[PDB]
Design a protein around this motif. Structure first.
Motif, PDB file in Angstrom:
ATOM      1  N   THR A   1       0.913  -1.229  -0.079  1.00  0.00           N
ATOM      2  CA  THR A   1      -0.028   0.006   0.230  1.00  0.00           C
ATOM      3  C   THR A   1       0.754   1.307   0.247  1.00  0.00           C
ATOM      4  O   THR A   1       0.574   2.031  -0.744  1.00  0.00           O
ATOM      5  CB  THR A   1      -1.020   0.000   1.185  1.00  0.00           C
ATOM      6  N   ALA A   2       1.989   1.111   0.952  1.00  0.00           N
ATOM      7  CA  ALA A   2       2.931   2.263   0.838  1.00  0.00           C
ATOM      8  C   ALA A   2       3.545   2.766  -0.450  1.00  0.00           C
ATOM      9  O   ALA A   2       3.955   3.575  -0.842  1.00  0.00           O
ATOM     10  CB  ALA A   2       3.786   2.120   2.166  1.00  0.00           C
ATOM     11  N   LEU A   3       3.807   1.668  -1.179  1.00  0.00           N
ATOM     12  CA  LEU A   3       4.645   1.718  -2.425  1.00  0.00           C
ATOM     13  C   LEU A   3       3.971   1.886  -3.700  1.00  0.00           C
ATOM     14  O   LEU A   3       4.444   2.307  -4.675  1.00  0.00           O
ATOM     15  CB  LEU A   3       5.676   0.587  -2.538  1.00  0.00           C
ATOM     16  N   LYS A   4       2.693   1.556  -4.107  1.00  0.00           N
ATOM     17  CA  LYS A   4       1.948   1.512  -4.861  1.00  0.00           C
ATOM     18  C   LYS A   4       1.438   2.758  -5.179  1.00  0.00           C
ATOM     19  O   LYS A   4       1.260   2.879  -6.788  1.00  0.00           O
ATOM     20  CB  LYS A   4       0.684   0.623  -5.112  1.00  0.00           C
ATOM     21  N   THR A   5       1.623   3.769  -4.513  1.00  0.00           N
ATOM     22  CA  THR A   5       1.073   5.057  -4.807  1.00  0.00           C
ATOM     23  C   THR A   5       1.726   5.969  -6.085  1.00  0.00           C
ATOM     24  O   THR A   5       1.177   6.657  -6.738  1.00  0.00           O
ATOM     25  CB  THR A   5       0.736   5.974  -3.598  1.00  0.00           C
ATOM     26  N   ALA A   6       3.107   5.923  -5.694  1.00  0.00           N
ATOM     27  CA  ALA A   6       4.065   6.437  -6.720  1.00  0.00           C
ATOM     28  C   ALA A   6       3.652   6.239  -8.145  1.00  0.00           C
ATOM     29  O   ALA A   6       3.753   6.872  -8.907  1.00  0.00           O
ATOM     30  CB  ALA A   6       5.445   6.315  -6.161  1.00  0.00           C
ATOM     31  N   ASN A   7       3.661   4.552  -8.190  1.00  0.00           N
ATOM     32  CA  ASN A   7       3.485   4.204  -9.635  1.00  0.00           C
ATOM     33  C   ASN A   7       2.271   4.724 -10.208  1.00  0.00           C
ATOM     34  O   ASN A   7       2.117   5.063 -11.331  1.00  0.00           O
ATOM     35  CB  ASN A   7       3.696   2.497  -9.521  1.00  0.00           C
TER      36      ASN A   7
END
Lengths: 49, 71, 49, 71
Positions: A1-7
């Motif tokens: 959840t923390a990492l997919k937002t940038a993509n």
DNA sequence: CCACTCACTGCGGGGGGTCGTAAACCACGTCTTCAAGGGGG
DNA sequence: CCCCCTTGAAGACGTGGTTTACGACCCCACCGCAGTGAGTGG
């Protein structure tokens, strides 16, 4: 959840940049062509009517 | 903290000044004569380029610049 | 003071890095010369006829 | 600040109108003129008055100027 | 011969001694207007 | 309470003579991606 937002944001930015300059400019065009719309079925289940 | 290449070229100009003012009849080697000219050019370059603004301009300030480091 | 520009007179000509190192190289393509040879000539490593 | 200084200047102009014709030229020449600053002696010969008379006239005129402004 | 990589690169998230000039003044002074007071309740 | 003096001096503005002071110059014997390039071998 923390990492997919940038993509997700990068993809949204690319889509906005590529599609930003399209605007409806005419009431009607003299074309007659088009596409064929049919329901989609996968595995025997009608996914979309 | 200054570039080594810049310091070398500053000394090269000082070396040329000593060569132009060399008297061979004295009998001393050019190495001992030119050591004062080369170090004078390097010192003046450090004063003007150590910071974005010149730190020492007057006579008294220049003396304190090279002495306060050791004191 | 936000609008007035100055200029510096160069003692010797210098190459613009954008037109040299940004691939594809414009100077190399125009001269039909390899980029490595141009780099060697520019930074005083070899001669060119 | 521009609004505050403009409304104060208009009070000065209104107050100066209440002064007599001779006193207005005394204040205007010595204090309002920028190219020249008329002294006490210069205004004396133009109106045939004494050097102290010009100086003594400003005090009473300025009191009237203050009275109109303060009201 | 041009096919078919593959390593490569770049793109996003230290002394003294003189000299000239814009500072840097302390005297310099005479000018101004500081003016003590003068008379008309 | 208008008027011309007085009469003593306080400061007012230079001012470039006089004098420091600044600044400068002289000598010193990860991440996957794609385009590039040789580099073959043929």
């Amino acid at each position: 959840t923390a990492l997919k937002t940038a993509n997700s944001g990068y993809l949204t930015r690319r889509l906005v940049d590529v599609a930003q300059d399209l605007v409806v400019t005419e009431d009607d065009c003299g074309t007659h062509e088009g596409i064929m719309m049919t329901p989609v079925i996968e595995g025997g289940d009608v996914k979309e009517p | 903290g200054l570039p080594q290449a810049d310091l070398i070229q500053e000394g090269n100009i000082g070396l040329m000044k000593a060569v132009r003012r060399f008297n061979p009849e004295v009998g001393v080697r050019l190495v001992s004569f030119a050591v004062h000219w080369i170090k004078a050019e390097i010192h003046e370059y450090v004063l003007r380029n150590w910071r974005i603004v010149k730190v020492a301009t007057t006579k008294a300030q220049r003396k304190l610049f090279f002495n306060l480091r050791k004191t | 003071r936000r609008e007035r520009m100055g200029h510096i007179e160069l003692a010797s000509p210098t190459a613009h890095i954008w037109f040299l190192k940004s691939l594809p190289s414009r100077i190399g393509l125009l001269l039909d010369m390899p980029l490595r040879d141009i780099e060697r000539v520019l930074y005083f490593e070899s001669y060119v006829v | 600040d521009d609004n505050w200084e403009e409304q104060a200047a208009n009070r000065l102009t209104d107050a100066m109108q209440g002064l007599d014709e001779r006193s207005q030229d005394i204040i205007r020449a010595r204090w309002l003129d920028e190219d020249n600053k008329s002294t006490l002696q210069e205004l004396a010969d133009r109106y045939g008055v004494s050097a102290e008379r010009v100086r003594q006239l400003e005090k009473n005129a300025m009191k009237k100027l203050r009275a109109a402004i303060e009201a």
